[PDB]
Structure 1
Amino acid sequence: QNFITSKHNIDKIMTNIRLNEHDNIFEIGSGKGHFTLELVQRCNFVTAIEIDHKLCKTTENKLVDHDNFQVLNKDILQFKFPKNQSYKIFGNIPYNISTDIIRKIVFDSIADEIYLIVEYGFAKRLLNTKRSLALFLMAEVDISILSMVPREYFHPKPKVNSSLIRLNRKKSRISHKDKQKYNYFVMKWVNKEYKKIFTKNQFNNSLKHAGIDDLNNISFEQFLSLFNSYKLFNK
């Protein structure tokens, strides 16, 4: 399924993407040379990553008269992203893409932007409140559907589709300062344990101030309001 190769699609989806030849990026998955090639000439440098040795050789060649190399073959989860130079990230790892890779990628790198095709269903998984994962990512990165990946641009596996997503950061809050506090909150909130967050004197105006009715459908923004109220309550 490690497909999706065919320069015409790999040009049509790169279409809406904002990489250029000033960007150094990380190829989270390798695939089968397909993408690590379209980018090597599109961005400055590239550093792919896929563990099994075979694949790297595959890539290794599909990239000649092209020296923007680096096709390391280690466990991404274990990978140490740079914490100095600025860069982006791309990964055609739908099917193989977990949440642990999405975390490495988002909370453990200073990657400015993260583009990645993911099963469309995995998108909401990241796009819905009352789902910590989302409430956590949304505090720094901005998740958005950029494109879709209809037909079998890959091979089979439908039941569903893939879809291109962009994760772009903002300096934004949720100050490391109060970040253990934001996690509790996120934790307790999604766990419906509002009894640990604020008191009922609070669970109310808080909701009323965030202008929250469908409490079962928050808007992060509202969750934001909440955390803030919470943050400034003391009983």
Structure 2
Amino acid sequence: QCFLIDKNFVNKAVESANLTKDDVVLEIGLGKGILTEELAKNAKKVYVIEIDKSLEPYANKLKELYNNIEIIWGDALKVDLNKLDFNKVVANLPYQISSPITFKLIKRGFDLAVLMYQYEFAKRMVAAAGTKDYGRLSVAVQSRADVEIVAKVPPSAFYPKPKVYSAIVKIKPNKGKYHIENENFFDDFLRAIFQHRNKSVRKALIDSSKELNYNKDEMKKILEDFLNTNSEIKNLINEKVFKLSVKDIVNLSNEFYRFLQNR
């Protein structure tokens, strides 16, 4: 585990979290508790989910100085977040859990998250439509939240040192912006189309038709009829997957869902 030892980056993450004494913060991972302490100082209360019980000495020492820290010993991928009341998440994430934890947190919901990722992962998260790092992860995150890189973090900020850069990413959930009709279908639709990101949406959906539980002949006919509903759909499905904006992907999947339900 690479612990964050540079207080300048701790400060940047905390400042970006815009904390007040009315905020309740969830932290994933304790480390030496350098971030934990700053959260404790500034927030109403901090929950720390930590998998490694050997780190108890840091926890015990922290509770002697701060009365508003609660440790939950366990695996953050296993813990039922629904049973916790918090409005913000601030963490130097274990990079191996980056993807599942991000969606688990977004599913649970929060006002704002400020999270450390590997830099490449963060770049994919915030990638603009039609660019080389734009992909399924970009759309899955941006369709549900506004995301931005707050700072690039060098290996020297950590001990022991990682091999690559990290990034602080700010996440502000945004349900209204795009409005996903059906979460399950949208997830299936995203999987199908980004299995073939350089192909047209049409050709991607035919190739990955089994991801939506249709055979290739059914899907081809479906899209013939779907294309006949309006000219906007025609232009969208003929375009390359990675070139569609998040807005257009959400709208397209919404319309396709409705089309399929009526069929």
TM over 0.5: yes
Query: Which letter does structure 1 place at the counterpart of 2:168?
Result: L
> By percentage of residues, which structure has more helix?
2
CA distance in 2, matches of 1:216, 1:171: 22
> By percentage of residues, which structure has more strand?
2
Alpha-carbon distance, 1:84 to partner: 7.5
Alpha-carbon distance, 1:29 to partner: 1.4
Alpha-carbon distance, 1:213 to partner: 5.0
| Aligned position for 2:117 | 118
Alpha-carbon distance, 1:185 to partner: 1.8
Contact 2:50 2:72 (8 Å CA) reproduced = yes
| Aligned position for 2:216 | none
| Aligned position for 1:72 | 72
CA distance in 1, matches of 2:84, 2:234: 41
Query: Which letter does structure 2 place at the counterpart of 1:219?
Result: S
Task: Say yes or no: does 1:51 pair with 2:51.
Answer: yes
> Compared with structure 1, are the counterparts of its residues 200 and 16 closer, same or farther at alpha carbon in structure 2 (3 Å cutoff)?
same
Query: Which letter does structure 1 place at the counterpart of 2:162?
Result: K
Whichever of the two has the greater Rg, that structure is 2
Structure 1 residues 51-106: Cα deviation after superposition (integer angstroms, max 9, x where no partner): 11121331321443310121121111111113684511111125344322223222
Matches for 1:102-113 after TM superposition, within 5 Å: 102-107=102-107, 109-113=108-112
Contact 1:135 1:220 (8 Å CA) reproduced = yes
Task: Say yes or no: does 1:199 pair with 2:223.
Answer: yes
Alpha-carbon distance, 1:27 to partner: 0.7
Alpha-carbon distance, 1:215 to partner: 4.1
Task: Say yes or no: does 1:152 pair with 2:163.
Answer: no
Contact 1:145 1:164 (8 Å CA) reproduced = yes
| Aligned position for 2:172 | 168
| Aligned position for 2:20 | 20
Structure 1 residues 183-228: Cα deviation after superposition (integer angstroms, max 9, x where no partner): 2322222234322465146467425259x85543322112123223
Task: Say yes or no: does 1:208 pair with 2:208.
Answer: no
Contact 1:90 1:114 (8 Å CA) reproduced = yes
CA distance in 1, matches of 2:191, 2:9: 40
Q: Name the Cα RMSD after superposition.
A: 2.8
Moved more, 41-50 or 163-172: 163-172
Moved more, 122-131 or 218-227: 122-131
- Long gaps (5+) in structure 1: none
> Compared with structure 1, are the counterparts of its residues 202 and 127 closer, same or farther at alpha carbon in structure 2 (3 Å cutoff)?
farther
Contact 1:146 1:164 (8 Å CA) reproduced = yes
Alpha-carbon distance, 1:165 to partner: 0.6
Task: Tell me which of 233, 243, 246 is aligned to 1:220.
Answer: 246
CA distance in 1, matches of 2:6, 2:257: 51
Aligned residues: 230
TM-score, length-scaled by structure 1? 0.82
Moved more, 221-230 or 72-81: 221-230
- Long gaps (5+) in structure 2: 197-203, 210-218
Alpha-carbon distance, 1:17 to partner: 2.6
> Compared with structure 1, are the counterparts of its residues 119 and 84 closer, same or farther at alpha carbon in structure 2 (3 Å cutoff)?
closer
Query: Which letter does structure 1 place at the counterpart of 2:39?
Result: L
Query: Which letter does structure 2 place at the counterpart of 1:167?
Result: I
Contact 2:13 2:114 (8 Å CA) reproduced = no
TM-score, length-scaled by structure 2? 0.75
Contact 1:50 1:74 (8 Å CA) reproduced = yes
Contact 2:106 2:173 (8 Å CA) reproduced = no
